[PDB]
UniProtKB/Swiss-Prot annotation, chain E:
Protein name: Non-haem bromoperoxidase BPO-A2
Secretion signal, residue range per the UniProt entry: none
Quaternary structure note: Homotrimer.
Record lineage: Bacteria, Bacillati, Actinomycetota, Actinomycetes, Kitasatosporales
Top-level lineage group: Bacteria
Family label: Belongs to the AB hydrolase superfamily. Bacterial non-heme haloperoxidase / perhydrolase family.
Provenance organism: Kitasatospora aureofaciens
Gene: bpoA2
Length: 441, 441, 441, 441, 91
C-alpha cells in the first residue's frame, strides 16, 4: 500500500505503508537504514494485545520512493502529517525508534497533539547530538558526522556491515540474542534503500530538537539501552529526561541500539504495560460514557441502582456468568422489553466470557424492529455505513440520523451475527439508540 | 372485498368475496336465494380444521352487484374462473350447494381441472332437472319452472316465505334443528338480493349438465338429504351417482334441502373427513415437494439416506427431539456447512416440538452470509415481498429472482427472528435456495 | 366512510366511520354487539351542544370489515390509534360504552394522552371482570365466559334475543323506556355483525385493565346504571372508582346496561355538563400563559400589580364592567399607548360581556400600525395565515415570523372587526406581539 | 500486476500476478514460503509447449500484500476465485504445489468445476495431515505443528535455513541437483514474505481436505517425490490416491519436497503429457465448436456429410494432402463460392501440412469482397482489434459487431497474409462470419 | 514510477523509471543483467554537476514488467521512444 506525499520532477513521491489489526491506532516509525518491517517483533505483540498497528517506510527506505529531495525533519514530519491526515487517525500513539524519534518530536512540536494520545521514544536522537559550545552534552563534533557521510558515499554496502556490528553489538549478541540470518535480513533491507537517501540521512541526525521538547503535551515514554554504542545513553536519553522529567523513563540494561530485536521482550513488556494502562483508561472513558447513555433509558429507582452496579462490575472486568446475568435481566419487573434487549445486548458485548451461550430469545424479540421491512431496510443501510466507521463518535454520529426503530433493528442484526462491527462502533450504535429513546421520554 | 367480473352500461359488475384462514384453499359456492354467509357453520369447521376458506356472492345476490345481465351457467362459470385466476388459486377444492353445484360442473367441464384438487356436490341440480322425453328422470316439466318465475315476479318477498318453508322443512325442523331467528336471517338475505336476479335465477335451474359430468376428472363427493323437498333425491343425487359411480356418495337421512344449517354436523362431518383428508394429502404432496428440493443439495451416499429418513420421520410427525437432531447434523462429516444450515433451518421449522431450544450458532453462521451489506440489502428486499405471499409457489417463484447468496441471507433473517413469514412461504424460500444451489453444481 | 387498519389475506381490513358537526372532537366507541349508530341519541345532543362527533364500527361489527383476526384489546386500541392519527385529532374526548371502555383504558395506557383532553367511561368493564384468587371482586368465573362463547357459537341469532332482554331490562322497560321497534333495530344491527367476531368478542371481556388505570392522566367521568344486569355495578364501576378516586362519578338509579337509550336524558345531561367543564378547564390553562406574555411588556411596579390582578379577575370570570376597565386603562400614567392598546384589546376579548360597547379610539390609534401601508400589507398576509390556524401555539408560531409593526396592525385589523379569528388564535397573535416588544426592551 | 481481493483497515489487499503466453490457461499455485516465481522451470516448459501461464503470489508471500487476516483455505480459495473470475478464465488447468494443493481441492469442492478442465496435485497436503484417532494415517500430532509456529515466531530467518535443508534434501542434492545460488534465491524470497503470514501459514497445513476429494469432478494428476522429508509420501500422496483411485498417479523416485527445481525434468515431462492429453481434448472441443459453426452454413445433404467427415479427419490429424482437399472443394457442385472460400480457408488453417502450396485463387476470389473500399475499411478496422485478441470467444465477439461483407474481407486479408493473427482468433473470426451468414438464411 | 509501453495478454507492460534533479536531461540506459540503479555512482556526480537525471529499467529487468515478448532492439528502441515522448524530453 502507498500514500503519495509529493512530487519529484515527472514522478510522484509515494510512501509504502501497512495497516493491521483493530483498536487504538499505534504508529511505528522506523530507524536508519531499515524499514517498517523492522518492527515485526513489536507489531506481533501489539496485534495480540489488541491494537491497530500502522507502519510506513520513510522516503528513501524500504519500499518507499527514492527521491533525491526532502531529507530533513520538517519534510519527514510533513510526510508523517500526510499519513495521519490521509488515514484520519484519532487518538493515536506515536512510537519512534532512533531516527523515528526525530519525527515524533518535530511533528508534535509543529503540528500539535490534536490526533495524538501518547508518544514513545526508543533509542532517541534527542535533544541535540551535535557537540558545540552551547551544546556541551552533544555526542560528537560536526567532523564526525561529515565522516559517516563520506563513508556511506565511498561504499554504502560495505558500510552497512560495520554499522550493524555496532548497531547490534554483534561481538556480544551474535548467536545469542541475534542470529546471523536476522542480521542478513537487516543488511538486505538497507541495501534496498535508495543510494542518495543513505548518504543524505546522516546529515539529519544532528538536528536540534531542543525547542521541540517543551511542546510535548501528552504522556511520554523514554526508553534506551544502556549498552547503546550508536546513540550513547549519556548524550541522548539521560539528558533528554532532564529536559522532559515528566516522561516515564526506562533503561534497558546492556541493551544495544538494535534493542527492538535483541531485547524485544523487555521492549514489548514496557511498551505493553504503558499501552495497557492507556487502554484501561480508554475503557474507563468509553465504558463510563456508554454507561451514562445506557442508564439514561432506565427509570430512576433501586433497580437502576442494581443495573448500574452490574454494568460497572462487568466494565471493571469482573468476569460475570452471562447466563445468570441474562436470566436476572429477563425476570426484572417494570423494565421495558426494549430496555431489557438493549441491556441484554450490552452485557453480551462487554462480558469477558460468553461461555458459548446461545443468543437469547427475549433480546432477539426486543431488537427485531417489529419485523418491519422498512425498518430492516434502513437498518441494513445504517449497517453498511457503520462497517466503514472505526470510532465511537463517528459511529454514534451517523446512527443519530436514523429512527429509533431502524436503530433497534440494526442492533438486532449485529446481535444475531447477521452483520459485524467493531466493539467501539457497536457502542456508538447502542448509545445513539439510547439517546433517541431517552429523548422521546 | 370485491372482484370485478365485467361491465354493465356505465357500471362495472363486482362480486363480493371473503378470504379467510391459511392452508389448502376451499371455495364455497352458495345456493338460491342466499349468499356466501350461508356457509358460516361449514366455514367455522373448515377454519378450525386448518383450511383456507374462500366465499363469494353470485351476481345478483348478497353483496354482489345486481345487473340485469349474465344469468346463465356459462357466465356464472366464467365469473368463478375470474375469481380463481384473480386469486391464483392452486390445488383448490370446489364445494357447491344447490345452484352452486351448477358452477362446479360447468367450470370443471369447460375450463378443466388444472387448479382443482377435488370437488364436492351438496344438494345437487345434476344431471338435468327438466323432465322431457329424452330426460324421463327429470324432476318437473317446463311449465312448473315457468310457474316459479311467475310467482317470484308477482311478489318475491312473500315468495321467499313459502320457499324457506320447504327449503328447511320448517313443519319438521322449526324450534328443533332451525330457530325462527335463523330463518329470519335467511329471508333478510334473500330480500337483499336483486329483484331481477331473483326472477331470472329459476330459469337457470333446468340447465342440462349431462355432458359436463364425464369431464369430472378429480375425486368427487356427492351429498344429498333424503328429506329434500326442493331437489328430490330421486331425480338428482341418485341418478347423478349413476352417471358418476366413482363419486364418493353420502345420503343424509331425513335431511331437507337446507341441510347446511339443520344438519351442519351431518354434511359438515361427511365433509371434514373430506377437507381434512385433502389437507393431509396436500401435505403429503407438498411434503415430498420440500424433501425432493432439500435432498437435491446433498451428495449421494449413506448420509443422504439417513437425512432422507429423518426428514420423512419428522414430516410423518414421528421424529421430534430437535436438540438431538441438531447435534447430529452439526457433527456430520462431509456435509457442507451451508447444507447443514439449510437442513438445520428445515428441521426447526418442521419439528413440532422446538421446545425451548435456543437457535443454533452453526446454522446462524451458515445462513448469515459473510456480512456483505449488498447481499443483506437484497435479502431484506426479498423478505418484504415474501411478507405479502401466502402460497408455497408464489413464495418460491419470487425467491428464484434472487441470487443464492441473498436467498441464504434471507433464510438467516427468518431463522434469527429478524423477520417473520408463514411456514408454507418459508418452505418456498428454502426450496428456491436449494434449487439455485443444486443448479450451480 | 372507511379507514383501513390492516390486511387479512388478500383483503384489507376497513373500519366504517362517521364524522359530524364542528367544534371540539368527541369520539364515541360502541358496545357489543352494536355499532356506531347506537350512539344516535347522544350524537344528536352533542351536535346541538356544538361538538364534532366521530363514531366508528369496531372490526367485526356494524359496517366494518369482518376478519377472523385481531380480537383483542391491543389490536382494538391500535385500531383506535389509526383512526385518531388518520384524522389528526387534537384535544379529543374519548367516550366508551361497555366494550368501548376497554379501548379507552388500553389506548390511554399504551399510547398516552397527547391528543386527549378528557375521557368518559359508561357501563364499564373495568377493572377486571374475571373472578380469581387475586381478583376477588371479579364478577364471574372463567367457566361463565366459556359459556357465553359456547352459546353464541350454538345460535348467535337466538342468543341476541335473550341478551337484549337483560341488556335492556325489557321485563321492566319495554313499552315504557324502550319500544319494541327500537329493540328490533338492535337485533338487526347485531345479526349484521360478523359470525366470527360475535363468538370471539366475549373472550376479550375479562381483559385485566388494572395496570391501565394508573395511566389515566386526564379528567375522567365514570357512569353506571345501578340496575345493570350485564355489568354488575358492584364488580365494575364501584371498584373502578376506588382505583380512580379522582374520576367524576355518576350512578344512574335503576338504569340498565343499555342506558344510552332507556336513560338517554340522564346520560346526555351528565355527559354535557362534564363536556362543558372540560372546555372551561382548557380555557383556564390558556389564560395563565397569556397573562405571563401580557405582563412581560409592563414595567415592574404597583401598576403592574393592579393590571395583573385585573387580568386574573376577568380570567376567573368575574364579569367586569368593560367601560370602567377601558377608562381606567386609558387614564393610566406611565403606560405606553401601545401597551394600553394591547391590554385594551386583551380585556375586550376576555371580558364576559362587552355590553355593546363601541370600540375605543385610544386602542384603535395604538394598534393602527402607524397607518403604514407596508405594515398593513404584511398584517393582511399574516391574517390570511391565522385564518387557517386553530391552535394557540400554531398561531403564535407563524406570528413570530412578522415584525412588531405588522403584528400590531394585524391586531388592529381584528380589533376593528375587519377580519376575524378564533379567540385562541387571537391569543397567540397578542402573545407573539408581546414577546416581540418585550424582546426589544 | 495486481488483483484486489479485499480490504484490511484503510488498505486494500492486492495479489501480485503474472500472465504469460497464449493458448489453454494453466494456473500455477505456489508453496510455502515461496512465490509464483518458484515455478520458473515449469513456466518455461509450458510456454514452449504452447500454454497460457498464470501465476500469482498468495496473500502474505512474494509481492502480494501482507495482511494479518485471512490465513485459511476458504479465504485462500476465495482469493483464487477472484483471480479466475477477474480474468474470465475458461477451460483452465489448476496446478498446485504443496500448500497450493489445498487451494485446488477447496476451490473445486466449494465453487465447482465450471471453468476447470483438469487439476494437478504436486507434493500434496491431502487428505488430512493431522494425526488423530479418526485420522490414523495423519503425518503428525497437533503438538508438532504448534512447534513449527513457535519456531517461526522465534526467528523466521534462521528458520528458513533449516527448512530449505529438508525442503531440498540439501545433504543429498546441493552441488548436484540444486546450486547454492538457487537456494540463496529461495531464502531471499521467503525473507521477503510477511512476518505474520510466515507464522500463520503452518496453522493452515492440517486442514482436513477429506470431504473436498469426492468433489473432484475432472481429470486429476497426483505427483509426489518418494524422498519427500517435508510431506511424507506415505501420509499424503499414497493415502490420497486411495481416496481418488481415478487420479493419474506418478511417484518421483528419491525426489525431495522441492522437486520443482531438483527434478524439474521428471516434473515437466509428466505434467506436459497429462496437459497434452487435456489440450487435445480442448482442441477437440474447439474443433467441434468450429465444426458446428462451419457446418451451419452448408445445405443439408450428402455433400454436407462428406465435408463434415473431412473436417473431422483433418481435426483428428488424419487427413492431410491439402492440394487434394482444395481441388475437391474447388470442383464441388451446388456449394456456394463463398462457402467454398470459408471451407478453403478453414482447411488451410487446420491442415498440419500446408507444405509449399500457393494460396488458391478460388478462395481469394470468394473472400476478397468485390473490392469496395468501405467494406475493406471495416475489415481493416476489425483486423486491428483482432490483433489484440488472444481468445476464441473474444475474437468471435468483436467480429459479430461487423457485417458479413466486412467479415469475409477480413478473412481474405488474413488468408492473403496481408495481416496475421493467432489460430484461435482466426477460428473466432471464421465462426462469427459463419454465424452471420447462416443467420441470414 | 512507471511508464506503460505496451500490452501482454491481460496485463500491460510497464517500465520502472526515476526522474531526478533539474537542468539538462541526461538519460542513462543500463546493461545486462542490471537495472537503472547500477548508474548510482554516475547519477550522484551528474546531480552534483547540475543535470536532470533520468533512469529506467529495460523490460524484463530490475523493477520493470517481465513479459515473454519484445526482446529485440527495435522494441527496446520503441520502448525508449515512448519514455522520451511521455516525458517530452528536449535537448
Amino acid at each position: 500500500p502507498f500514500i503519495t506525499v509529493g512530487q519529484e520532477n515527472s514522478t510522484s513521491i509515494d510512501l509504502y505503508y501497512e495497516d493491521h489489526g483493530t483498536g487504538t491506532p499505534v504508529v511505528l516509525i522506523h530507524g536508519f537504514p531499515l524499514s517498517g518491517h523492522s518492527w515485526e517483533r513489536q507489531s506481533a505483540a501489539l496485534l495480540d494485545a489488541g491494537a491497530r498497528v500502522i507502519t510506513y517506510d520513510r522516503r528513501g527506505f524500504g519500499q518507499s520512493s527514492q527521491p533525491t529531495t526532502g531529507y530533513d525533519y520538517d519534510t519527514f514530519a510533513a510526510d508523517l502529517n500526510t499519513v495521519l491526515e490521509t488515514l484520519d487517525l484519532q487518538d493515536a500513539v506515536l512510537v519512534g525508534f532512533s531516527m523515528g524519534t526525530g519525527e515524533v518530536a518535530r511533528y508534535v512540536s509543529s503540528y500539535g497533539t490534536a490526533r495524538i494520545a501518547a508518544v514513545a521514544f526508543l533509542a532517541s536522537l534527542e535533544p541535540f547530538l551535535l557537540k558545540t559550545d552551547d551544546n556541551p552534552d552533544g555526542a560528537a563534533p560536526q567532523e564526525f558526522f561529515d565522516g559517516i557521510v563520506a563513508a556511506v558515499k565511498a561504499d554504502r554496502y560495505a558500510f552497512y556491515t560495520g554499522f550493524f556490528n555496532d548497531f547490534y553489538n554483534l561481538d556480544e549478541n551474535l548467536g545469542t540474542r541475534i542470529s546471523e540470518e536476522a542480521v542478513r535480513n537487516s543488511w538486505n533491507t538497507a541495501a534496498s534503500g535508495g543510494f542518495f537517501a543513505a548518504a543524505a540521512a546522516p546529515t539529519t541526525w544532528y538536528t536540534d530538537f531542543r525547542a521541540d521538547i517543551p511542546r510535548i503535551d501528552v504522556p511520554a515514554l523514554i526508553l534506551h539501552g544502556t549498552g547503546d554504542r550508536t546513540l550513547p545513553i549519556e548524550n541522548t536519553a539521560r539528558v533528554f529526561h532532564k529536559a522532559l522529567p515528566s516522561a516515564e523513563y526506562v533503561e534497558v540494561e546492556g541493551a544495544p541500539h538494535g534493542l527492538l530485536w535483541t531485547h524485544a521482550e523487555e521492549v514489548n513488556t514496557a511498551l505493553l504495560a504503558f499501552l495497557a494502562k492507556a487502554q484501561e483508561a480508554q475503557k474507563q472513558k468509553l465504558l463510563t460514557e456508554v454507561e451514562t447513555y445506557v442508564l439514561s433509558i432506565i427509570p430512576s429507582g433501586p433497580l437502576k441502582a442494581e443495573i448500574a452496579q452490574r454494568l460497572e462490575d462487568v466494565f471493571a472486568g469482573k468476569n460475570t456468568d452471562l447466563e445468570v446475568l441474562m436470566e436476572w435481566l429477563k425476570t426484572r419487573p417494570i423494565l421495558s422489553p426494549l430496555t431489557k434487549g438493549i441491556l441484554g445486548f450490552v452485557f453480551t458485548l462487554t462480558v469477558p466470557s460468553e461461555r458459548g451461550l446461545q443468543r437469547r430469545r427475549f433480546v432477539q424479540n426486543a431488537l427485531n424492529g417489529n419485523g418491519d421491512p422498512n425498518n430492516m431496510d434502513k437498518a441494513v443501510k445504517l449497517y453498511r455505513k457503520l462497517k466503514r466507521e472505526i470510532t465511537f463518535h463517528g459511529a454514534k454520529e451517523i446512527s443519530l440520523s436514523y429512527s429509533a426503530g431502524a436503530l433497534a433493528s440494526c442492533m438486532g442484526l449485529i446481535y444475531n451475527r447477521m452483520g459485524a462491527v467493531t466493539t467501539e462502533v457497536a457502542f456508538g450504535l447502542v448509545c445513539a439508540t439510547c439517546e433517541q429513546i431517552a429523548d422521546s421520554q
